Structure formats: structure tokens, C-alpha cells
């Protein structure tokens, strides 16, 4: 139920494939999806979740660098997939920027994204 | 054991008084302690912690505005006090800045501070 295209509330598109081994691979891009806005993503998920109605734990990372741009930062999303008619992936994320030692204290932003199968 | 002066690794000084009711009141200042860098702090703590060797849960807030400066932001520290010869307050914090709707996604920084009774 994870493989496919997902959309968040900020206008980003998450295209992912869930391997049978627990691997997550794909791309993260803007609403449009032009070449310069596409970034590689890799992650892992629980390929054998509980059957008590619990969600499926997962996480992935995107380093904000491609063959055109580099924001010297990386974001990791940690959350869980909830299946159903209105399936979604609820996450909390950490965005860390490369900084000097003096600015290390303010190197990480925290937030949350909800992804859905419909825009 | 909480009342007193505390120091973090960044060079900040935390002066606090722990009330019998569970209130925390004090000031957060720079190493130098000049008036322009002194801010009011208020918080709460567990006034009746467990006796199984567990730490004492606590938290406080500092809005970064005083009678001299205003950084339009506020930080909350959440953690626990651990007593002993080398007492410490281990925390994780959230720094939120006032932002426009468009910048709300990057309004909050996350980090961690360890406070000790010795510099």
C-alpha cells in the first residue's frame, strides 16, 4: 500500500517504491517536477507490520543535492503509514544544514508532514 | 536541589528558584550577565518525584524579549533534573520564531542542552 505517488500539504510530490526486503527508494520533487527540482530519496520500512490495527513504521532521507543545485542540507522523515480508504503517511521531520561550529546550535529545524494519495 | 545557578555548554547562565508548589521562576542570561541579555523564565517541575532513582521531570519557557531587546521568538526546554555529586539537568529544546504563513514550515529549531552547577 506504500508504493506509489504521495502528496503533502506544502506542494511536494513523493514517488516511492517499497521493496519486499524493507527498502524504500524513489524521488522527492516539487508540484511541477522539473529536473532541477527532483531529488533522490532512500529509506526503510517495517515489511511485516503487526496485525492489531497498528500503523507501519517507516522513515526516509533526502539530501538536498542533485546534478543542478545543492542546499547543503538533508531532511529525514520518521513516521507511519496508515492504510484504508483515506490512507496516509503521518510524519515528523528533521532538517539539518551543514554549519560552522559556531552555528551548530541552530543547525536543525523540526516539523511535521502528512502525505495523502490525493492532492 | 534545583534552586540555584546553572550553566550550559553554550555559555549561558540559568538562575532559578524551585517553589514548593512546583513552580520555577528565574532569569536566563549571558555569561557576563549584563542587563540587556537578561530574560525572564517561568516553568514547572514535578515536586514529588518517584523514589526509584528516576530523574525529576521539568520544563520552562523564555520569550526572547526584555526591556531592551526583542528577538520575536521563544524557547521551551523540556527535560529532567538528576541529583548527585555531579548534578545535571538534561534537556531538549524548541525555539520558535514568529513567522509569516509562508515561512511557518521553518519556524522551529530543535536542540539539546546539558546544564551543570559548575562552569
Amino acid at each position: 500500500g506504500i508504493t506509489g505517488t504521495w502528496y503533502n500539504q506544502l506542494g511536494s510530490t513523493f514517488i516511492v517504491t517499497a521493496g519486499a526486503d524493507g527498502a524504500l527508494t524513489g524521488t522527492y520533487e516539487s508540484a511541477v517536477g522539473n529536473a532541477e527540482s527532483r531529488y533522490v530519496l532512500t529509506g526503510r520500512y517495517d515489511s511485516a507490520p503487526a496485525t492489531d490495527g497498528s500503523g507501519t513504521a517507516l522513515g526516509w532521507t533526502v539530501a538536498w543535492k542533485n546534478n543542478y543545485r545543492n542546499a547543503h542540507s538533508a531532511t529525514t522523515w520518521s513516521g507511519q503509514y496508515v492504510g484504508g480508504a483515506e490512507a496516509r503517511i503521518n510524519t515528523q521531520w528533521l532538517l539539518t544544514s551543514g554549519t560552522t561550529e559556531a552555528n551548530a546550535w541552530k543547525s536543525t529545524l523540526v516539523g511535521h508532514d502528512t502525505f495523502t494519495k490525493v492532492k | 536541589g534545583i534552586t540555584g545557578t546553572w550553566y550550559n555548554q553554550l555559555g549561558s547562565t540559568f538562575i532559578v528558584t524551585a517553589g514548593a508548589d512546583g513552580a520555577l521562576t528565574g532569569t536566563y542570561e549571558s555569561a557576563v550577565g549584563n542587563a540587556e541579555s537578561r530574560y525572564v523564565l517561568t516553568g514547572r517541575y514535578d515536586s514529588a518525584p518517584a523514589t526509584d532513582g528516576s530523574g525529576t521531570a521539568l520544563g520552562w519557557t523564555v520569550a526572547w524579549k526584555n526591556n531592551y531587546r526583542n528577538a520575536h521568538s521563544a524557547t521551551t526546554w523540556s527535560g529532567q533534573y538528576v541529583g548527585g555529586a555531579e548534578a545535571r539537568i538534561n534537556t531538549q529544546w524548541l525555539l520558535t520564531s514568529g513567522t509569516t504563513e509562508a515561512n511557518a514550515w521553518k519556524s522551529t529549531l530543535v536542540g539539546h542542552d546539558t546544564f551543570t552547577k559548575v562552569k
Binding site: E36, S37, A71 | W105, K106
Partner: peptide, 13 residues
């Protein structure tokens, strides 16, 4: 407004 890939930036700033 958005100048970072995370907030869905399309064009460079």
C-alpha cells in the same frame, strides 16, 4: 517565497 526544496520550491531564488 519558498527558496528551499523542502517547501516545494520550483524556481531558484
Amino acid at each position: 517565497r519558498c527558496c528551499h526544496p523542502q517547501c516545494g520550491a520550483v524556481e531558484e531564488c
